[PDB]
Amino acid sequence: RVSSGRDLNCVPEIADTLGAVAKQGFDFLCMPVFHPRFKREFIQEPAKNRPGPQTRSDLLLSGRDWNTLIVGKLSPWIRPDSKVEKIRRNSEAAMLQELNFGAYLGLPAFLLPLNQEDNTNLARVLTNHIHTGHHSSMFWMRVPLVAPEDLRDDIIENAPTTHTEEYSGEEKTWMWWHNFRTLCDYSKRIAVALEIGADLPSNHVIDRWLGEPIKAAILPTSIFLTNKKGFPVLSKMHQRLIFRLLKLEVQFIITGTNHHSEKEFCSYLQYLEYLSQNRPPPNAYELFAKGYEDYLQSPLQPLMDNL
Amino acid sequence: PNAPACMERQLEAARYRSDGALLLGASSLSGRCWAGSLWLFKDPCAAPNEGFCSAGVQTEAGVADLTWVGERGILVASDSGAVELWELDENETLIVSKFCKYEHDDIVSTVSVLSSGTQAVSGSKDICIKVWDLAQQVVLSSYRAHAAQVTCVAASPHKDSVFLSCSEDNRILLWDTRCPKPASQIGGYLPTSLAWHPQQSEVFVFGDENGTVSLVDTKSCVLSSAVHSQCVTGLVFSPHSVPFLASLSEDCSLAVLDSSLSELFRSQAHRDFVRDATWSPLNHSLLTTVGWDHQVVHHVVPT
Amino acid sequence: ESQTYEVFEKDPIKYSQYQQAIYKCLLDRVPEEEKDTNVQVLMVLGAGRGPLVNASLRAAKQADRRIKLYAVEKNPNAVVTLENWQFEEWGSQVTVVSSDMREWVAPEKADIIVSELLGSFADNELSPECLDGAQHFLKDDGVSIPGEYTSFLAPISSSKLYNEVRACREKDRDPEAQFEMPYVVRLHNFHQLSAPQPCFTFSHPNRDPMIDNNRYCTLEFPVEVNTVLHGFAGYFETVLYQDITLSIRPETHSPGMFSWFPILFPIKQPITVREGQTICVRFWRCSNSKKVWYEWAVTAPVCSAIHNPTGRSYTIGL
Amino acid sequence: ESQTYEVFEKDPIKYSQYQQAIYKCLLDRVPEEEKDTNVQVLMVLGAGRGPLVNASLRAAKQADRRIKLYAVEKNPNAVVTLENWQFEEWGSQVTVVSSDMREWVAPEKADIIVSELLGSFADNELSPECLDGAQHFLKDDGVSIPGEYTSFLAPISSSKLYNEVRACREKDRDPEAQFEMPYVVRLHNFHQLSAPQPCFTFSHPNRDPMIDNNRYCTLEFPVEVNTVLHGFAGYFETVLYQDITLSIRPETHSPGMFSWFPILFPIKQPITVREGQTICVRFWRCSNSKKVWYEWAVTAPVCSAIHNPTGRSYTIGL
């Protein structure tokens, strides 16, 4: 009933990894195109002239598998907005390389992070890629509900967490998104992969994301509680959020290791399915309207026109 | 030699133990299979030939970082999110997996063993730092103190509760698990490597992304020098009474510095990234480096 | 993209012809007494995901001759495939080069260069320019496969295809740009008004001083019916080696091969043609330091406008 | 055209500065005891109709030093002027070269290279690329005039100029292309919202390995008034030799000089700015093998779209 994917940052064998992911009921797999730790030089010798293949072969999967089942990920070392000019220039070249390889493979989507305020050069490189060649590949911007700095543990002695209600400051991750997509001039290829945290923010911070192009909702395994049976579940706060997200018809991505070790990994997905079945069924309106969501039509003119 | 047929191109780590047996970790960061392996060399000069090894084993995933657990044990920082523990057998020919706990939600990038030897601390790209017990094989504590990927963690040589950590959030945290709030932030460019001073409990050095090597006292005023042109990958002190600091980088060079961070030695031997350095315990003037060019170079340091 | 190379590789007739062409050239260049003394230096110029390299290996094995392969490829995404293959299968016999053939400084001259840079109109992928710039690292007695290729044109009448081109009008460009650019199309609902005639020919290696790839060709097509000319179907033939050829010209079409579809050069306005009248078309191949393009004009029975002047509507990037 | 060179030559302040710059460099490079032993090799790179050559002759005469001139010029129409002048006036001391400086194989290395390849935004005529490609035939201790140049930006509010750009909409292109390209304009009805700040700098000869002319600059402009930002005025300064400079930056403007007008980088949509707020602009200099262009974006107090991505609306031809 629900469309689900699996996020991994470790794939030792691409064929084997998919099989495991598919057996657990997932529809697609978010994974790297180059090894996350395989940092590459493009200017300075001798490392720029590094021999051998730069990544895996496209032949390891079928064209159809790449097209439907794989979602690309930008490498974590790639930081286009670095203060160091060398790292900037390298990350630029690397970002293009990875994006170009994504297009080559014909991936349906590709994940890029929004994990800081300034993503201007990131936007500039992505916009350049979008306006080069032809592709229908989507770009999912990984953006958290709550910034990492704002959900860190209060365990630094000489750096306490902000215990002040900052209305605008708690909405900061939306402003990261807003600026990025404004720079990119509202490209229809750029959408949101909204990362859900352990502690949900205030209601206004969530309402912020109403009317935004949310295509994915990333759920870490860490946010799952455990019931009496000893299987993963979510809070009533998160339940209401998933129920809201199911109306938007987003694709749920599971990320992180199995903290519920005693159980299978399908259990997480089975819970989302459980929620999917257990929702208020569509009324006469929602049943009939199903299909016309945000579909623009010209106002009828029965006087001027003959219906 | 009762081991894998071929080791991986990118050599990630190299460590000497008491007697002088060279430990090697390696990852395949390219090609069909992205796995890792562990190797032992009772003959350091034979490296990195697989036909002349004491021990060798193939791991499930890549090896991001390792270090010696005394004599027998080897603790691994895996890409899988697991921190793996392997133990040499009594003959020291095989390497059997002691434990492998998937607790991190992302690549485990750095690991370090604390003073006691029954405990270790790991840092991961999931922005977490975890304290382990190697006996009970469980996580004692879990700390989300940083706001970005944890780059390096380094245990205090002589204090069990104390360790350093650095991250891409531009923070160097000095820890002490005895405190309610254990972390303490020391006051431009992101820190990439940490190294405690072997003879001074309050002194440590850190390398940054811009290539600068810095000298920091805990109490206080800092000294620094522009050693490399690119990011500093690691810092290792010599076993001398008056230690020499070996610095490695992504500029494909090695530099040995004095106490005042003045350049003594220079080596442009590697053609790829220099990943680790380990001083020979037998001969204190010998230093072994490993890199992604698949070289295991042995340097004669003028001392 | 990957799946563009995939569909090229799915044409076994083409590569069997390349295999046979190389097989024959190896036997001609190396005698029986020099079987194991002489190692021929082959260079695949534009290796892609390596269908030719494989064919070059098969060719050498069926001939029983020694070869040293270079696999030059500019597309870095394809070079990933080559290097993975090279590590796993080929080995050190194949040296994968990640470079432009016009730039690459060769450490050795070639006995044979092999290429697959031909489109539907032969030279529409700038095969002349690329092989001219790779010519320097061919031995003075060296061979090119293909050694020659020719493009053909034929006048067609298709009110369907004319109406199809018309519909390719886009915002923010010339209202008639769509008529001044060729299209790859499986021609179905159309009428070929006259028999195809050769347009442009290229020989490799080129030995004419001041190698000029610019051209101007006048063709006269006898029409024996009344009709409405809407454009010109384009085809091509290529000589790989000697008698080993590939062709999409309908009358000499290679049987089974489905790699190249016909090309279509439209005209802005349809032209009436009476029975007995001759359609006279003029084709230019033009270039500067940055681009190559075609211009064309009908001069009989009535004049058309010159299509695509200065490559305003269509250029091929160098 | 002829009358474009004519109006450049009608600026005596500029060439007197070039004359003085060369005069000083000759005295520094040649001592008094080596007056008639040492003949300095000068090379005017982009000679036009020869205003610099004349200035180089005047400079050598007032310095009383020997020079050997080359006059490199790619424009063949201008080379006609040079050669007529050279035959009638200059003689064999000046060797007129009809070539691109990036291509020309020099038969001798230069002690000084002199150039006039600067526009309103300094590097908007690709002076970096040209002088980089001419760098090889400079002596290891050789000088370039100019030796350095810097571009400056300043935020402006002009509802007139915004409305003027708006009106440059043309058929058959992007409806907002006019906002994604700079304009040379004598700014009159406008308000400079903040003081100019340096954007891009270039040094010749360039001694940084992997000479990269791509750039990315972030500028923060403190605004002390309420206003409506409509674009960014561009200026430039250049160091010819030592203390001899040319400048169109309002605060350091060379008096009398009227060769270069200011440049204007518009924005699609006007941006409100309150007193106390900072205007933050981002400027990129981008390139490939064929083109160079600028991209730009406002990031504070609100974000604009990135203007001219991939040089879609505006490129500078290499």
Ligand SMILES: O=C(NCc1ccc(F)cc1)[C@@H]1c2ccccc2C(=O)N1Cc1cc2ncccc2[nH]1
């Ligand atoms: O004509 C073409 N192929 C015909 C075809 C057959 C079956 C099918 F299902 C789809 C298309 C291709 C092509 C496809 C699509 C869009 C454009 C083209 C085109 O210029 N081609 C010619 C071509 C093939 C080729 N191979 C190697 C090197 C250079 C090459 N140039």
Ligand SMILES: O=C(NCc1ccc(F)cc1)[C@@H]1c2ccccc2C(=O)N1Cc1cc2ncccc2[nH]1
């Ligand atoms: O700014 C400009 N001149 C200002 C001006 C002054 C008086 C007048 F009656 C008309 C124009 C010219 C110019 C004119 C017309 C259209 C465009 C431009 C332009 O890019 N310029 C800058 C410029 C001058 C120059 N000289 C040499 C080499 C490179 C140069 N680049």
Ligand SMILES: CSC[C@H]1O[C@@H](n2cnc3c(N)ncnc32)[C@H](O)[C@@H]1O
């Ligand atoms: C098999 S389709 C033609 C192939 O030749 C490659 N190619 C085209 N021109 C060049 C060139 N100048 N140098 C190297 N490879 C080229 C293309 O990238 C493609 O893989």
Ligand SMILES: CSC[C@H]1O[C@@H](n2cnc3c(N)ncnc32)[C@H](O)[C@@H]1O
């Ligand atoms: C005086 S305006 C600049 C002059 O330099 C010339 N020029 C610009 N670029 C080059 C080049 N690469 N080689 C030679 N002349 C050039 C132009 O044709 C013009 O006459």
